[PDB]
Design a protein around this ligand. Structure first.
Ligand SMILES: NC(=O)C1=CN([C@@H]2O[C@H](COP(=O)(O)OP(=O)(O)OC[C@H]3O[C@@H](n4cnc5c(N)ncnc54)[C@H](OP(=O)(O)O)[C@@H]3O)[C@@H](O)[C@H]2O)C=CC1
Length: 283
């Protein structure tokens, strides 16, 4: 019933807060430190970062600045595409950990499978990366492990070799790209789906239908999308560097979208991505 209290239980029993702050494109230094501090002070208990964002030290600094005990906060970071492989994944994990200034990381994700052309030339290095994730998990260095931007076929590849099933799959998900088929698969395999670019990188916020739905509840279009995420049982990580938007985005536990509204948002799907298609990426 609140941003600090809404949880999704992963297949290993770990409670991951359903709502988090994304920090992609938040500059290292003061901007990231403030955004993180403001989020935590507003009751967020989850921060999503990545090695490639180069702001992990700032995430750690903002957490320390907030006064909120590290044990109450869920930190996700990600292994970058160029570091896939077994020993290289272990090394990258340690680098993230030291930058974050923590003893353990809550969730570690393979950032991308890498595009089909790279896979064809270099092999599916995400599999040996997953084996490294399994060792890190065995050694209690990380509380949960998962992937990001994996389609059903990438997931089948991991499921065929894994000793631990990926616990989260973080993918582009918003009302123009609802990921219905991937969600059906992930539900079957107990893989929780987490939405990236949930506000469509900001581009969805002028949407007539969404704004009109919001007006019914004295909420903004952004708040409608995020309430839709919550009611679809998704984990969501909207990004802002602005304190007012950070607080606004979290203020979605004082209303609920009715059936017709949910239907109208579901009708918006066009399978249109703002981000790269994981199959076609040339990185
Ligand atoms: N696994 C992966 O490959 C990826 C993961 N992600 C993760 O997902 C997170 C969220 O996705 P992201 O693409 O960053 O973007 P979002 O879909 O959250 O949209 C972010 C944009 O919306 C603006 N915004 C945020 N809240 C509001 C509001 N209430 N009113 C008006 N404008 C608003 C922000 O502006 P401003 O900041 O100026 O306020 C920013 O321009 C990322 O930060 C990252 O953590 C993202 C992409 C890929």
């Amino acid at each position: 019933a609140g941003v600090d209290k809404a949880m999704v239980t992963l297949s290993n029993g770990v409670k991951m807060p359903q709502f988090g702050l994304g920090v992609w494109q938040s500059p290292a230094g003061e901007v990231t430190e403030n955004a993180v501090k403001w989020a935590l002070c507003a009751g967020y208990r989850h921060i999503d970062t990545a090695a490639i964002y180069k702001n992990e030290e700032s995430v750690g600094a903002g957490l320390r600045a907030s006064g909120v005990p590290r044990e109450d906060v869920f930190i996700t970071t990600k292994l970058w595409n160029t570091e896939q492989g077994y020993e290289s994944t272990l090394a990258a994990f340690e680098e993230s950990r030291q930058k974050l200034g923590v003893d353990y990381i809550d969730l570690y994700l393979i950032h991308w499978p890498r595009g089909k052309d790279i896979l064809s030339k270099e092999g599916k290095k995400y599999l040996d990366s997953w084996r490294a994730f399994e060792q890190l998990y065995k050694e209690k260095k990380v509380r949960a492990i998962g992937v990001s931007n994996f389609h059903i076929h990438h997931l089948e590849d991991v499921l065929a070799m894994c000793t631990v099933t990926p616990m989260v799959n973080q993918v582009e998900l918003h009302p123009l790209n609802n990921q219905a088929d991937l969600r059906a698969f992930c539900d079957a395999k107990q893989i929780k789906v987490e939405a990236w670019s949930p506000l469509g990188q900001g581009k969805l916020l002028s949407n007539p239908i969404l704004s009109a739905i919001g007006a019914k509840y004295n909420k903004t279009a952004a708040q409608v999308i995020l309430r839709w995420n919550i009611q679809k049982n998704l984990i969501t990580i909207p990004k802002s560097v602005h304190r007012e938007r950070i607080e606004e985005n979290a203020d979605i536990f004082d209303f609920e979208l009715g059936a017709e509204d949910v239907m109208s948002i579901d009708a918006l799907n066009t399978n249109s991505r703002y981000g790269p298609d994981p199959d076609e990426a040339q990185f």
